[PDB]
Antibody, heavy 212, light 213 residues
Framework: EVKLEESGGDLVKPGGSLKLSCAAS????????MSWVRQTPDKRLEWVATISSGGSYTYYPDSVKGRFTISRDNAKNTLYLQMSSLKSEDTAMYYC?????????WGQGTTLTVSSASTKGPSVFPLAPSSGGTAALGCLVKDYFPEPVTVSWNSGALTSGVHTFPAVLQSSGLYSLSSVVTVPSSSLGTQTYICNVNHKPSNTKVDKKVEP | ETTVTQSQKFMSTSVGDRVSVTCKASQNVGTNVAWYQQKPGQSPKALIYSASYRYSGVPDRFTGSGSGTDFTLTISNVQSEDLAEYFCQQYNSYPLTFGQGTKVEIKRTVAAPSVFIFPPSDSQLKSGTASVVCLLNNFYPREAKVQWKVDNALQSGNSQESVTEQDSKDSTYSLSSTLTLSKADYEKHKVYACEVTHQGLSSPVTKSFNRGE
């Protein structure tokens, strides 16, 4: 019943600033310390800030001291991370976490990309399907920046047999990936298959119906 | 600053067996060590605190041991759903620090890939590029050879492979190989073939199409 939901991640220029938010629910927020932990592209985890339950004590590692400020609003049940003087090494997925020493609940994460490059939304192309039984179909999600994109099928209702591949960085400096699913081949003419692509940094949403 | 080190980048086990993951702190941390499980595409989930305590809802098959500097996470009765990265973390002092993670991998029986090929969509060619996608679905083990032939000419350098993590339910991999051509090069040839070699196949399987048909 404990939930932590982060928001605010974006692409930001080197030297810029960004404020992340974390909305807590399902526990007495004011009775716990709260923390932020980030995960870099190499998948290492780095603790970056802790605040006491009442907000009076805060703790930071040397890598972010004076650039990052953790704060909370107990009336609103929200935690914040104010980030400034952003550096290339700050690029990461940032996790809201409950408690100040070990972390018994984690949020879903919000992503920061520190970059002077421009954001670009993806182009989405069908991967058309079609003995028988099992057909394969999917979507090619091409030429976006930065990561990540999220891909669902039929607005999250089709999950069985879905494989969304890791993005690959192309020479153009843009990312590409495919998402595929295997379905019963007998349903292709009646059952509808739509891939839903969300690229938050460019505020682009694309739904592609994939037809035989 | 107190560090924690995980020397095993990977650990492999089979369903029903056990696996142990080590974690070494650079100085005495008492029992102030936690373990986390991170399944593909998910945030970390808490498993163990104070070296050996299990949260409510964590099965008893997850155990932790150690005090001082040497800590061990042991997963007994391993399930396919345990495919994940496992991290230790010390909290005897700030700064709080994490190990680099150990990926627990699941051995299973051989499963041949199901192979599919997808021509470039008409939508895509309109912009001067052609992506041809070959899909290898639900196979094990990871080793797989994919060869692109264009009018029987072997391609090399102009394709990229991406692989999923082992599936939480059946422990298989899936892989995409994407051949990227200029539209002008794509229109210069007819037969596009993806050939797949794998332990589960008696001999290589080929999926192909003729551009324009």
């Amino acid at each position: 019943e404990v939930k932590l939901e982060e928001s605010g991640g974006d692409l930001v220029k080197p030297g810029g600033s960004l404020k992340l938010s974390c909305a807590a629910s399902g526990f007495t927020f004011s009775s716990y310390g709260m923390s932020w932990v980030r995960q870099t592209p190499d998948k290492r985890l780095e603790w970056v800030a802790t605040i006491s339950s009442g907000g009076s004590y805060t703790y930071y590692p040397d890598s972010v001291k004076g650039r990052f400020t953790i704060s909370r609003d107990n009336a609103k049940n929200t935690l914040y991370l104010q980030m400034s003087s952003l550096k290339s090494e700050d690029t990461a997925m940032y996790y809201c976490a409950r408690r100040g020493f070990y972390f018994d609940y984690w949020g879903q994460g919000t992503t920061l990309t520190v970059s002077s490059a421009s954001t670009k939304g993806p182009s989405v192309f069908p991967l058309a399907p079609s003995s028988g039984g099992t057909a394969a179909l999917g979507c090619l999600v091409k030429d976006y920046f930065p990561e990540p994109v999220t891909v669902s099928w039929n607005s999250g209702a089709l999950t069985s047999g879905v494989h969304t591949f890791p993005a690959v960085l192309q020479s153009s400096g843009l990312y590409s990936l495919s998402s595929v699913v295997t379905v019963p081949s007998s349903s292709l003419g009646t059952q509808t298959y739509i891939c839903n692509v969300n690229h938050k940094p460019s505020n682009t949403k694309v739904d592609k119906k994939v037809e035989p | 600053e107190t560090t924690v080190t995980q020397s095993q980048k990977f650990m492999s086990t089979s369903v029903g067996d056990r696996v142990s993951v080590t974690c070494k702190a650079s100085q005495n941390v008492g029992t102030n060590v936690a373990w986390y499980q991170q399944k593909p595409g998910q945030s970390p989930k808490a498993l163990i605190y104070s070296a050996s305590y299990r949260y409510s809802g964590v099965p008893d098959r997850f155990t932790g041991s150690g005090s001082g500097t040497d800590f061990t996470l042991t997963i007994s009765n391993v399930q396919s759903e345990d495919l994940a990265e496992y991290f230790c973390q010390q909290y005897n002092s700030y700064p709080l620090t994490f190990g680099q993670g150990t990926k627990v991998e699941i051995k299973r029986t051989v499963a041949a890939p199901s192979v599919f090929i997808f021509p470039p969509s008409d939508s895509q060619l309109k912009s001067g590029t052609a992506s041809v996608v070959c899909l290898l679905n639900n196979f094990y083990p990871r080793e797989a050879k994919v060869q692109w032939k264009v009018d029987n000419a072997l391609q090399s350098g102009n394709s990229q492979e991406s692989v999923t993590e082992q599936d939480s339910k059946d422990s298989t991999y899936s892989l995409s190989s994407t051949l990227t051509l200029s539209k002008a090069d794509y229109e210069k040839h007819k037969v596009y073939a993806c050939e797949v070699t794998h332990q589960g196949l008696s001999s290589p399987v080929t999926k192909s199409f003729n551009r324009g048909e």
